[PDB]
């Protein structure tokens, strides 16, 4: 019996005390030990080498502890692992082996799950310097590295990173690499307070399936002048998203430089999330040199049901290549978003706009392959001041993009800079049903709304239909000569347009083409034969031998004759028609117009 | 030895006995109270004085239990309080201090979560009286009170109100008010058999964040006359919302009174959520009086992807002023829903409408400031017999409003009562890419399916597209002489009109304007001079002066002659077009035209 | 002491190991047993006849002791049962009672849930035959059945059907069979490795409410020819959906067989989910004989934002009758979706849909009861070779469908084969905001873009819009003599259609219809009177005798003479317009006109 006082207070105490389950007669035998080994925490591997516990703090390191709670769970063919709830966990040191090629503090392990509930915080050693917290990675070569299954991470708790500046702009900083990742998962979880280049990373290269973001906040992880590019979640495998998340941020340089979201393999989405203080919303790209795992195509791409307020672009859509492998893009839905570029100076920030068609990552805007999206449903506003922003900025080759049922309030509808890349635009639709908005109105002097700085247009469709007046504009859509257009369907609806000098400029004539169909209101000056009854009137210009037909949009004030109400044109170049001419005499009206041509 | 047997009986008995998880030799040397500790439930503090547990039961208030594992548990710096499953715990008293001013039972404490597996219940103690079950507010007056940072309720857990009726209209009564609220959630909790004022409220005054409902089931919360209102979740903190929940009701009262959603502050959300009972669906209103937190402008509210079977209004915009604050609602979305006016008589419950623009709770309707609204891809069914149904109530003053590409098939499209508010209206855009549904088809004797009973519209755009016949309509659109018309587009397309005496109706004449553009169909009678030969036929009627160009919609019967495919107008208001008299002679036909004026 | 230290190593010895939480004096004086008792998991029953715990392996039945677990927890009024991460756990026998009626395993019971954090996996004893792993019926007779209440199944296990082929296409297989079903879930599941019918179950013909599968996957589940047909998930009561799921399938059989989901009762959702490799996406679909429930009518029904490849339709609707019910499918929202054909031959599996109107069981085409549909803002994509791909193939009675501002982009946009059903439609509705993407373009050969072979429609419209060429089609739509049409809206827009020979095309000539509104491009051979001045133009064909008006696409290459801009019609059949010869002279021209009948 002193061995029985001694076993009880020993170590293997509990594994002599006998338990039944609610004295149940029909439940197993067990002892006390039996059960507590249901669970685990951190605490049963925060200890001493005489195995006396540690409490956490400021001054203790706490990442081996946890690294072995993480390997003896694994070795046990996996469960969940609870970092408690009332306290700070500081981790203050790198971990080694396969993920230290990674600047990796924890290694993760199939089956083991995070259940953190207390504060994960980094101590200041980390200050300066890279570091990715949980790694996934087990190689410091991703390509030698093993995969990472069925690990999740959850809770209510916090991982903050201390709000340590990067050292260098070259380093980079990470919350979670999941890795080559299939069936992992991040819920619930705060990341806060850091300088960092990403807080969550899904796959590598295409490698990794059903990884998620879900319930998650991200609140002020830009800080610094050196941070180089910031993308709160990199989403590098298929068949995984990120879904009803916060992301806040607050400094400046986060305007500039920060995304929210970038998805960059199929059938991968971003959905519920609301985003603020972030240059950009997401990133839609497939990179040649990320298509090792899952092909070199970008499709079933969703961004759905957002809310943002951003300085910079929504949605940037990209492809490229390599000497090898040619990226391309195709298969996306953007639609239910309501966004808004933030109170801002007009070029205070990069470019505002809904929809960007961005080069490449050396600026190549001859590499793109993209097609097949559906822009649809979404409201977009910016402030009236603010003169960089544009439904879409199309800056590289495009071989489709399809807007529905739109509401664009900003300044431009199409745009891109002259001077700048000339971009091959194919499939560019613009359906009749997007209402373009009134708050840009008196403030674009000089400014097309639609400015066409193309190197060509072929296969497109702009339906301009205004809902206010905008006399301040210089025209509705202008061609610079420089842009072919073919194949292609113009046309400026007349509403608020009776009073506008220019609504539709091609400033080659290109709406003289074989396949072009195009129709806009203009002002023509008539002059009459004298002849009594029907009697003709013709144009006192030469310019119209490319219109089919033409009608009135004017009233006439005159009793004594009417000028046509339609014209077709002549082999010069005028426009004629038959009025009449009640008395005899020759007439010289002034007349507004719809000229059509093959429409 | 004695004190030995006499230690492992006593309460300090689990923590003399050792552990070490699953025999590690690397793992923490515990004793049994150790891992014991890493939880809790309500059973460790449901006891008398002398420590022994009482079991929960109708008879029983476990009211101080609940608090005092409440406080504890926020004295170590928090974490999660399992409520157990398989018993009902009864509330019987009012809690004390900071909570008596909201007539609090619970109060909430930062970092102090619920797990809620069993069932929470009111006693009859509550009958007839006000309460708040759980209260977050520290300080009878909310503007003196701290925060509440961090507690979420959760579980597969029950709270039931015990179907106690109110005791007087201006009595109050709430589930869960999480008072100044940063990080709190409601997730997977039923709301049952009650009559209440709120189920949940987030924030207060614009003060919180990051506070959100999901998964919750809310059943029969409303049950009687003396209720005076009732709205479910009552949002009142920014960066929060509400997603995938279930809300009904049976009672007739809460046809009349009760909605599921308020959203009162910036960047809020209502989504995926299912409604059946209720009269409302959501408001979507800035109160100048709940400004102090957020600001005065409710933006980036979005209402998307909810199922709602309403007996009143889906959506109800609005917003106020006080003596020193001025509310302002922009940049909404309401898109993806799917709604209809369930089972009743005509005038038997408010006014049926998927939209309204309301005015402030003392009626007025001349202080509102909202615009940037985009309600797209929403379908709406009533009944055909319900007389008072409407895509849009417009009932207040209108900044801005557009719908693009949903399918409304309800009594009126746009509605107002006559002789009641006069809405000055600005930007309201109703796209032609609208689809107007059939239902109530031949039931519109009398009725103008666009009702346009306003002080004044511009800037807005009616492009009505039928798609079935109703000859039982009075107009498709009217104007009453009372309502000033500018800077406007309103169109009818002629599919199915041919038969209707009125198309558009403009009782002032307003489509004169100089800035209207519109176009209708009408039936007008012509008669043309004798010339054999090109000859102009003439309108009988002199009411055409504003028609800038009209066209033919009839077929031509005659061999000898043919009326004009097209005509203008002249200044005495006669239409002037030139036919062609095969044979010589006086023509006088009717003809239906398309009206056309600056389009 | 001797029976201290023998109570202390019994079963019973936890019970008297005293405990007080976290030595706080306030806190109740409990037992350890008390503080294990309030969890539960598969060990505290997975013992033997003498309580020794069994180790579970593929040589071990754990079936006995799960049930076992189950009953107990029920007879204490529920809670939550834990399967254990790092073991699997076989089942290897059928269970008994009620269940065996149904094939079942295990017998779910009414608030008490599953906690899967381990595997669970059939044992070759199912090889070849029938099973449903989890039943919550307890009854043979679904009939006479009791409820399942309150019961969920969550975690991050799986559930492994052991790669078994069915023995005989006869035989059904299900996971989850939740019965007659309230407020039950499954959540976070893997269901994988099988050949089944259905993955889960909810409802019972309608009885059921609040059922919902959540962040689950199902990975190849079908894998032989001997699958008669699959449905992954079933929903059979109100109220109930899917919500952010991963469907997969592997095998060729998949492709003609699988269904992702089918909503079969009102009030029910699919959303935000994935699915690949699968047949169908959804069936929409209200059979009479499934009416008992929940009513004859299947409302409220919404499919959006889903992901989607699949070999034959996305989603298929569906009505039917019994000898005594009708069924009825009305207000159903399909929105938001991207959804591809994947790569195969033409006709190599069932026709390529994103709509299908499809027959009941029997092949029959005259029972249905479908309308008030919106399809909205989705995009499809089928690639080039895929002859059998639709917008819609509309193959059964149709009483209402409407599409707005969606994205098509495969062979067909209407589509009903020649020679099969010749169903009847009413309020087709294809609004002009959508959008008819070019991949199929130079494919079409022989083939109509709109190939309305139907019976009869009436009350629709159909507004084609191209945004690119294609001269391989033989018209953009075509209706056969068969077809009635009547108070219908057909128009083809101009743009792209200048070179083709046939754009709209009546066989019968239906578009003389007295209700018919229609307008398309046709080419006109006409010729003039010699007279010099205002001259008729008369075409020299004779079947123009419904053309209400006309007007010019084409230029004039004259210098002294004009044609017409537009036209009329007389009685013979002839265009007549006045035009202009400035000398005399017979003229004879061709021209491309828009031809407009009452529009
Ligand atoms: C911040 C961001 O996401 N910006 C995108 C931009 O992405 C490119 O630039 C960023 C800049 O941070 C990344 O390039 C940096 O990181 C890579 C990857 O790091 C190495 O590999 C990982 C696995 C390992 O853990 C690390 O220790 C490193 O060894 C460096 O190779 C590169 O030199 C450096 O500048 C980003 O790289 C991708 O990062 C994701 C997420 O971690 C990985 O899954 C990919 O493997 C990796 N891709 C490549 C090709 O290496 C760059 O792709 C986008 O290009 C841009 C336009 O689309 O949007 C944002 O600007
Ligand atoms: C039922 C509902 O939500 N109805 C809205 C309507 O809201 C207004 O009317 C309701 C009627 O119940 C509320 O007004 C009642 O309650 C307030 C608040 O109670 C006091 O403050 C809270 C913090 C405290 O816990 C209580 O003990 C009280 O001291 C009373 O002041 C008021 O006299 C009474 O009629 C609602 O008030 C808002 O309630 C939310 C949620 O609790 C609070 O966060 C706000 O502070 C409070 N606002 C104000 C201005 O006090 C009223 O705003 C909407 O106006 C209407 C149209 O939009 O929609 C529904 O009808
Ligand atoms: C695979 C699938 O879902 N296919 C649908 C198709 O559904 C019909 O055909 C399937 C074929 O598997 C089902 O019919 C089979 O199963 C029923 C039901 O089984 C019996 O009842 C259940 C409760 C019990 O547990 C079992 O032991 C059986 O006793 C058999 O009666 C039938 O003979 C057999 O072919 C499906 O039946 C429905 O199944 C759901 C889900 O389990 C039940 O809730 C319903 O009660 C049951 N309905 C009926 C009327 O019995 C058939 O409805 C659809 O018809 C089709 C077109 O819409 O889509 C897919 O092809
Ligand atoms: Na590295
Ligand atoms: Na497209
Ligand atoms: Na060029
Ligand atoms: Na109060
Ligand atoms: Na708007
Ligand atoms: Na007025
Ligand atoms: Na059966
Ligand atoms: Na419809
Ligand atoms: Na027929």
């Known amino acids: 019996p002193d061995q029985f006082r001694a076993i009880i207070e020993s170590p293997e105490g509990a594994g002599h005390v006998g338990y039944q389950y609610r004295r149940n007669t029909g439940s197993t035998m067990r002892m006390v030990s039996d059960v507590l080994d249901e669970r685990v925490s951190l605490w049963d591997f925060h200890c001493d080498p005489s195995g006396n516990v540690i409490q956490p703090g400021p001054n203790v390191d706490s990442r081996q502890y946890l690294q072995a709670a993480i390997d003896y769970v694994s070795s046990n063919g996996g469960g969940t692992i609870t970092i408690p709830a009332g306290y700070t966990w500081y981790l203050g040191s790198y971990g080694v082996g396969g993920i230290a090629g990674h600047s990796g503090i ?14 994960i915080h980094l101590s200041p050693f980390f200050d300066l310097k890279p570091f990715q917290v949980f790694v996934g990675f087990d190689n410091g ?71 998620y973001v879900r319930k998650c906040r ?159 449903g979404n409201s977009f506003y910016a402030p009236a001041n603010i003169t960089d922003s544009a439904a879409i900025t199309l800056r590289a080759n495009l071989n489709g993009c399809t807007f529905i049922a739109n509401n664009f309030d900003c300044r431009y509808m199409v745009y891109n800079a002259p001077g700048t890349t000339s971009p091959v635009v194919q ?60 194949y292609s369907k113009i046309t400026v609806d007349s509403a608020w347009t009776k009073s506008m000098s220019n609504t539709a400029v091609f400033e080659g004539n290109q709406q003289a083409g074989a396949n072009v169909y195009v129709s806009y209101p203009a002002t023509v000056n008539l002059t009459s034969y004298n002849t009594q009854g029907a009697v003709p009137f013709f144009s006192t210009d030469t310019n119209y031998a490319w219109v089919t037909s033409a009608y009135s949009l004017s009233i006439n004030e005159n009793l004594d004759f009417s000028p046509p109400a339609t014209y077709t044109n002549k082999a010069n170049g005028q426009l004629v028609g038959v009025g009449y001419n009640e008395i005899g005499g020759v007439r010289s009206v002034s007349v507004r117009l719809m000229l059509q041509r093959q429409v």
């Open 218 to 376: 991200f609140i002020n992880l830009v800080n610094s002048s050196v941070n180089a590019d910031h993308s709160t979640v990199y989403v590098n495998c298929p068949y995984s998203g990120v879904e009803s998340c916060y992301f806040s941020m607050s400094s400046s340089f986060a305007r500039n430089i920060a995304c929210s979201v970038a998805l960059h393999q199929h059938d991968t989405f971003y959905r519920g999330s609301t985003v603020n203080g972030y240059c950009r919303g997401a990133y839609v790209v497939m990179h040649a040199a990320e298509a090792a795992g899952a092909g070199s195509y970008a499709y079933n791409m969703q961004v759905e049901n957002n809310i943002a307020v951003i300085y910079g672009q929504f949605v940037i859509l990209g492809s490229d290549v390599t000497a090898t492998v040619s990226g391309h893009l195709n298969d996306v839905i953007v639609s239910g978003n309501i966004v808004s570029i933030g109170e801002r100076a007009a070029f205070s920030a990069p470019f505002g706009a809904f929809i960007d068609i961005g080069p490449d990552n050396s600026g190549a805007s001859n590499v793109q392959d993209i097609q097949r999206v559906l822009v649809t």
């Open 106 to 119: 924890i290694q993760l392990r199939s089956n083991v799950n995070l259940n953190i509930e207390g504060r």
């Open 427 to 486: 499939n560019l639709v613009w359906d009749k049903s997007n209402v373009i908005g009134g708050t840009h109105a008196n403030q674009r002097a000089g400014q097309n709304l639609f400015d066409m700085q193309f190197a060509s247009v072929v296969n497109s469709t702009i339906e301009v239909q205004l809902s206010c007046e905008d006399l301040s504009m210089f025209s509705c859509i202008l061609f610079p000569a420089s842009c072919q257009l073919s």
């Open 141 to 211: 070569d991703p390509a030698s590295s093993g995969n990472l299954e069925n690990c999740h991470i959850y809770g209510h708790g916090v991982v903050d990173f201390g709000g340590y500046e990067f050292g260098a702009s070259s380093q980079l900083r990470n919350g979670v690499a999941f890795g080559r990742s299939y069936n992992c998962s991040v819920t619930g979880i705060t990341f806060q307070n850091g300088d960092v280049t990403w807080a969550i990373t899904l796959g590598w290269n295409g490698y990794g399936s059903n990884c």
